Amino acid sequence: RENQVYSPVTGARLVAGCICLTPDKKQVLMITSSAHKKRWIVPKGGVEKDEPNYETTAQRETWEEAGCIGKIVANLGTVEDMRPPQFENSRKDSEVAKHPPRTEFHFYELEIENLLDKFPECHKRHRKLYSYTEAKQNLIDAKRPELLEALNRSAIIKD
Ligand SMILES: O=P(O)(O)O[C@H]1[C@H](OP(=O)(O)O)[C@@H](OP(=O)(O)O)[C@H](OP(=O)(O)O)[C@@H](OP(=O)(O)O)[C@H]1OP(=O)(O)O
Structure with missing residues (x-):
């Protein structure tokens, strides 16, 4: 539908999500992408249009996509999907040609309180806890460095 909300400045799609950590902070909850079933994301x-704040979207998506309930404990701020829709060298560095972001993500850290077996997308995705090291590799494999930046801002133990 066109219930979707876009940045009035950049036209980026506004997205909210959760870094869901175990109480002991050693593991993060990841889900499989719907499109590519072997990619692990968050x-x-x-x-x-109806939602009054990013926290509402984040907790709604955490339930719908991962059957996860918990408490928001930190605002992890924003990251951008800077994937292009070719290059510009500058003497001692190279960059992709200027473009607006595809997506502006508002991320929150959640402490997991419960995982349910039945949730809206429970037949369309897998959902599993991963250590920092495994989750980092997962998000590089998924080609989602912005999601790794959000994970890095979280209190997850990086030992
Ligand atoms: O609503 P759409 O325009 O189709 O957005 C989709 C959708 O993102 P949302 O979950 O934010 O709606 C996919 O996510 P899921 O199907 O996994 O829920 C996401 O795929 P990822 O799983 O890889 O995030 C995909 O992004 P991609 O470009 O990687 O296909 C993205 O499309 P956009 O490129 O338009 O954001």
Whole structure:
């Protein structure tokens, strides 16, 4: 639908999600991408026109995509999907040609309180806890460095 919300400045799609950590902070909850079933990402989704804040979207998507309930304990701020829709060298560095972001992500750290077996997307995805090291590799394999930046801002133990 066109319940979707876009940055009035950049036209980027506004998305909220959760870095869901175990109480002991050693593991993060990851879900499989719907499109590519072997990519592990974190729960996230489009803000809808009715939603009063990013926390509402984040907790709605964490339940819908991962069957996860918990408490928001930190605002992890924003990251951008800077994937292009070719290059510009500058003497001692190279860059992709200027473009607006595809997506602006608002991420929150959640402490997991419960995982349920039945949730709206429970037949369309897997959901599993990973150590920092495994999660980092997962998000590089998924080609989602912005999701890794959000994970790095979380209190997850990096030992
Ligand atoms: O609503 P759409 O425009 O189709 O957005 C999709 C959708 O993102 P949302 O969950 O934010 O709606 C996919 O996510 P899921 O199907 O996994 O829930 C996501 O795929 P990822 O799983 O890899 O995030 C994909 O992004 P991609 O470009 O990687 O296909 C992204 O499309 P956009 O490129 O338009 O954001």
